[PDB]
Ligand binder design. Sequence first.
Ligand SMILES: [Fe+3]
Ligand SMILES: [Fe+3]
Ligand SMILES: [Fe+3]
Ligand SMILES: [Fe+3]
Lengths: 439, 439
Amino acid sequence: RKIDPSRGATLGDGTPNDNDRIEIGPTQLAFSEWAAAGLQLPNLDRMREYRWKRLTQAIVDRGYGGLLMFDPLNIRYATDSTNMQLWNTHNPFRAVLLCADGYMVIWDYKNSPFLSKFNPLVREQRSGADLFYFDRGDKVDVQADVFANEVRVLMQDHAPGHTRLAVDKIMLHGLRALEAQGFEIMEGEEVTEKTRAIKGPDEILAMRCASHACETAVAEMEKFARAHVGDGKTSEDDIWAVLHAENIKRGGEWIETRLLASGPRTNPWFQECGPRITQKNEIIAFDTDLIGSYGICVDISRTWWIGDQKPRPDMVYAMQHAHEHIMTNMEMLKPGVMIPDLTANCHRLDDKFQAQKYGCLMHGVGLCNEWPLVAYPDKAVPGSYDYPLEPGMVLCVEAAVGEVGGDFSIKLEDQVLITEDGYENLTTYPFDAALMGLA
Amino acid sequence: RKIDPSRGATLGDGTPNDNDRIEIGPTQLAFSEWAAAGLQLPNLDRMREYRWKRLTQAIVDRGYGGLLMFDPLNIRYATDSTNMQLWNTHNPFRAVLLCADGYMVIWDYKNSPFLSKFNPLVREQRSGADLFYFDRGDKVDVQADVFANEVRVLMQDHAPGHTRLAVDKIMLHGLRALEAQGFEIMEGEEVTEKTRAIKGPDEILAMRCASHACETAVAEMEKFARAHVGDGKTSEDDIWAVLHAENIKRGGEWIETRLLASGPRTNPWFQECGPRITQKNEIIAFDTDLIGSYGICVDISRTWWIGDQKPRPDMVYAMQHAHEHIMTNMEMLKPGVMIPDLTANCHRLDDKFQAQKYGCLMHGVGLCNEWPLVAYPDKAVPGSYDYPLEPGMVLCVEAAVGEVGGDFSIKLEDQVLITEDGYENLTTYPFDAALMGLA
Ligand SMILES: [Fe+3]
Ligand SMILES: [Fe+3]
Ligand SMILES: [Fe+3]
Ligand SMILES: [Fe+3]
């Protein structure tokens, strides 16, 4: 019945050593690689408790009575329970209520109430929070009233006297039913984003594991790419598919974008991974945007030169410039620095790269891309992110470098932890030596 | 430079024969398999025109002035343009406005206005519809008002006199800003679900292609499973990873669920694909829930026996019962049948299988799971889906068969087109011979 014969009743992360358990997670492949790498495993119970305590405190601090979550990523933060995450993202069938006294209720898919029972912090498993046309047709409104009354009763019993209810995102039928029950609806994302921005110690351990699994997956992809780019039939999709499979093999969950592109399709950036047949002596650039092991997002970007010739000198300069961009901007990071000061003091890209530079120079990361967004000075809005960095924040540091009308771009990105007195770059993946001008 | 040297200026679906184009789509591998299989390809231009005309007409019929879409799946329907779909599903950065005169505008990611330029029906590419805390922090409200005013001006110019604006789903700041501009917000999903439910000729062609690619990919996964299950290390995730890769290799897009499970993890159903090490002489059941080539959803389910020994007799019976369930229910399908009569006349499962039967016996499908939902008699809600089937609808037909406390379940499902005179089962994938009671 054990999935790992070499261990006792529990796995290294404290979960049941049971091949037949309901709960999923990292595979034996991932665990094996992490152990060989000397990575400490998170304790999931302590992690779940940390997140829950923190989210409750956030509600209390704002003087709210509760927080109601329909975003699958917020539900994942609150409960660590998944259920058809990707379907859930555009079908709001699921909901979690967390009250000011810490009492937490989930409304799950009717047929699957068992999916969150591994987490005892989830005190109740209900159903009927699915308020959208596919699931209920012309009778959404009736159930919206049933649900909103349930939320009223829960709030009466667990947040008496509170009328402020924070909601991340809710269908209009739901919004109106809640307001009909006398709730003042507050901005749920302001609560969830600032809570999720600070990782506890187990989250950081989990993230270290996911990063390692991601870098392993990327290394398989680079091996495949260098092995058969230019063979006349290997597509962008063929290469990218390796990342998909190696992620899933290690217990990863999905990939957020299609940001892999070859040759002239790298400029302008944001062209999507497709059928293009790759060529010898061309750039390939990509962004992992990966929801990986333990559901942790690993967001890094690399640019490869593949071929028998040397890359052009303008390619080497661009690569070196981008690398300088993220290493300079990274060095600004430490606790107490104000986010708009990052914007104001950031490394200056050459004029010819300014037009097509990235949408931010940094952003938060956790279970996916997260607050804060650190804009370049010409896009930054005063009063949008007037907050200081704190230990436990994790920021991805970005560079997109390419000219208007040019035939290539560089994309680089590392994932960086804020520590007690500075920063630690979590990303160890190599930079292409030819593009760096070192080979 | 051509991606397919055997063709002229265009590919079989009318798109440019250009290896370097922005637009993505099916790979040469997919096109090659479809040509081998005898499949007529969709014409994408005609398909895009059919959807747009139909969506515009839907607005006109209801007496609305416009329809505003933040669901990436509805955006896909209206424009056929993708952009970080999965990120978009839980980060509403994107919007499409379609007015009563057919005028259509997209607000896209700031850095990527070019992604919808291939569709001349999209008349403008703007930015600034991203109304959520990650993207704008404490200054969502300012841009919400800028966006809402833009919508007002467009509606004044292209739907003068109309104050009814259908919206599928929008963040509260956006909702408030639009209402402040005088709009009465109508249920957008009621419009999009009913429009999307009838597929044009080209959408049916695209779906035939997607179905074949999906079945091909599943064939690879079956090969992998039968060759490796029970080798002491092959996990659920290992098997499932094959479907991911093979889908991506054919220009597919993502998978909506984690519904693949082995052995006792199939009962109860909806346990998720994970690290479980698979065993010889065991059931593996799965649900593709796949967003495939041309962005079309293929939603089929099969159950497999892998082992030396024979399946148990109760397994074989359950499989037969399940297969009987869907084939009987499928026979109800033809134009003019009222959905609640599908419910009332459905095949009855044995008492022992009733408690855990699926959440529906049928549902629509197109770009993903869509309206209608056909519930079993004990869950159906009167007045929820009082509409007749029509030619061009596509419905998946479902069976979940398992006992309370049982150690396996059967899951079967086929994807069926409604024709002028009846139905056409689009799904050709075989049923497990041993489970069916053959040899
Ligand atoms: Fe990214
Ligand atoms: Fe990033
Ligand atoms: Fe399904
Ligand atoms: Fe289905």
